[PDB]
Ligand binder design. Sequence first.
Ligand SMILES: *[C@@H]1O[C@H](CO)[C@@H](O)[C@H](O)[C@H]1NC(C)=O
Lengths: 37, 49, 48, 48, 97
Amino acid sequence: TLADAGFIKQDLICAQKFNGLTVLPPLLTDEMIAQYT
Amino acid sequence: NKCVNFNFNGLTGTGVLTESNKKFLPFQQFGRDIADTTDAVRDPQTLEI
Amino acid sequence: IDGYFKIYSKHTPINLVRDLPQGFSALEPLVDLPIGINITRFQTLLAL
Amino acid sequence: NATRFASVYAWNRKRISNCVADYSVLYNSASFSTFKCYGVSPTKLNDL
Amino acid sequence: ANQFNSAIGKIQDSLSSTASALGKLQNVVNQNAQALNTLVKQLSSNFGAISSVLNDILSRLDKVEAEVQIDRLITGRLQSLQTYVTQQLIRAAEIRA
Ligand SMILES: *[C@@H]1O[C@H](CO)[C@@H](O)[C@H](O)[C@H]1NC(C)=O
């Protein structure tokens, strides 16, 4: 149960964002990984 | 909804302000985030949160 | 504490014939008064 | 500006509460020879 | 075929039921969450300054008197980042392997 992955912010992770801590999105999405798989 | 150099009672900073839905009890005036930072305030002239 | 005296309170219904209730609930602040005196003893008052 | 201050062993304490301060009166008054603060700077006293 | 099909079925019946399987992945995620939560929580320290809130210094003190307190917060916070980025690097060598 992931605590965020960068899926559109528009809680630990509100505090993180407000202190410049940002989770970045991975290059290959879980769909593209499922496709290579 | 505008970014502003806020202050309330001496709680200075810079931020965007918004109307809360949080039900404070009558004695309460600040709220705090998981960080130990403020995240909500009762306005000292008009008692909305 | 250090020049200040304060009282919190809670009220709840229960049905225990001779006991203090099993469960959990919290006391909200009601006043603060800067009395600033040594305090070492207390006594309750009740009416007839 | 009281007529008489107290003996330091018995240093008087007066509360100040439910009032608006104007620290510029004091911070502008030439009559003091010591006006030192120890958790704040005096220019900010009106701002807090 | 039937043994393979039965075995694939036992992986389903396993992974659906049990609460202990993905511990190897979950412990990596748990540390990433916790290290960010630790790096957040260090902002609440004094480092011997008069506050952990940056503005409660600046809105209380003048320029000269702030520089002591702010240098204390930089001395703390900056070590708080170098610690994390060390931990993250070392962790990264565990994951890269
Ligand atoms: C208050 O009373 C206690 C008990 O007699 C005593 O030890 C203490 O020194 C007193 N405080 C002052 C300020 O005299």
